[PDB]
Design a binder for this molecule. Sequence first.
Ligand SMILES: COc1ccc2nc(C)c(O[C@@H]3C[C@H]4C(=O)N[C@]5(C(=O)NS(=O)(=O)C6(C)CC6)C[C@H]5/C=C\CCCCC[C@H](NC(=O)O[C@H](C)C(F)(F)F)C(=O)N4C3)nc2c1
Ligand SMILES: [Zn+2]
Length: 198
Amino acid sequence: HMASMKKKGSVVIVGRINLSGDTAYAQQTRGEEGCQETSQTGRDKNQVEGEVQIVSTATQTFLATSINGVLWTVYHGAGTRTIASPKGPVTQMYTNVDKDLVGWQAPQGSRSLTPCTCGSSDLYLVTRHADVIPVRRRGDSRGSLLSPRPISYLKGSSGGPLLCPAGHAVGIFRAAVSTRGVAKAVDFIPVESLETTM
Ligand SMILES: COc1ccc2nc(C)c(O[C@@H]3C[C@H]4C(=O)N[C@]5(C(=O)NS(=O)(=O)C6(C)CC6)C[C@H]5/C=C\CCCCC[C@H](NC(=O)O[C@H](C)C(F)(F)F)C(=O)N4C3)nc2c1
Ligand SMILES: [Zn+2]
C-alpha cells in the first residue's frame, strides 16, 4: 500500500583507508548504530578526509574512491541510493548499470586522486583492510594478482582503487575472477571509462 511504502536509506561513510603516511591502515569513523541512524536521516556531520572511503548501507559494506572531484563506487553496492552529507541526502551525479558504476560529488574535505596518464601496467589494489596488493594489468579492465588469495580477502573492497606506481587512479575495483575460491585476477572500471562518463 502506498501509505506503507518504505524508502531505502542513504549510503553512509563509516571510515577511510589512510594512505597519508608510510603505513596504510583502515580507520573507522562511525559505528553500526550511528551508521543506521545516518542512513535513515541522510545527515552526516562527520568530517571527511582522504581518498578512499569505507561506506555502508543497512545491508552491505564496500569502498568508494574520490577521483577528479567525484566519489565513485559500484552500482551493485550503492544501487541508485543517495549518500549522506552534512546538509542531507545527495543524489548521484553519475549512474551506469552497464559499467556497474555510480558517483556522487566528492564530499567536502575529501582528497581526490588524479587520473593516471602513465600507461603503466604495474598496479596496486587498495582493499578495505588497507592491504596494498600488487596487480599486473592484463587488459583494459583486468589485472592479475601477483600473489593470489581467497576471494574472502577481497570481499567488501569493490569501489576501491587500482593505483599506478606514482599513486594515480587507474581504475575502480569491480569484481574478482576466481578458481576454486582463489582470486587470481580482478575486473575493474578503468579511469578512462570514468573520464568518458564525466
Ligand atoms: C545489480 O546491478 C549490477 C550491475 C553490474 C554488475 N557488474 C558485475 C561485474 C557484478 O558482479 C557481482 C558483484 C561482484 C562482487 O562481488 N564485487 C566485489 C566485492 O567486494 N563486492 S562487495 O563490496 O562485497 C558487495 C557485494 C557489497 C558490494 C569485488 C568482489 C569481491 C570478492 C568476489 C566475491 C565473489 C563474487 C565474484 C564475482 N565475480 C564476477 O562476477 O566475475 C566476473 C567473471 C567478472 F566478469 F565480473 F569479472 C564478483 O566479484 N561480483 C558479482 N554485479 C553487478 C550488479
Ligand atoms: Zn600514473
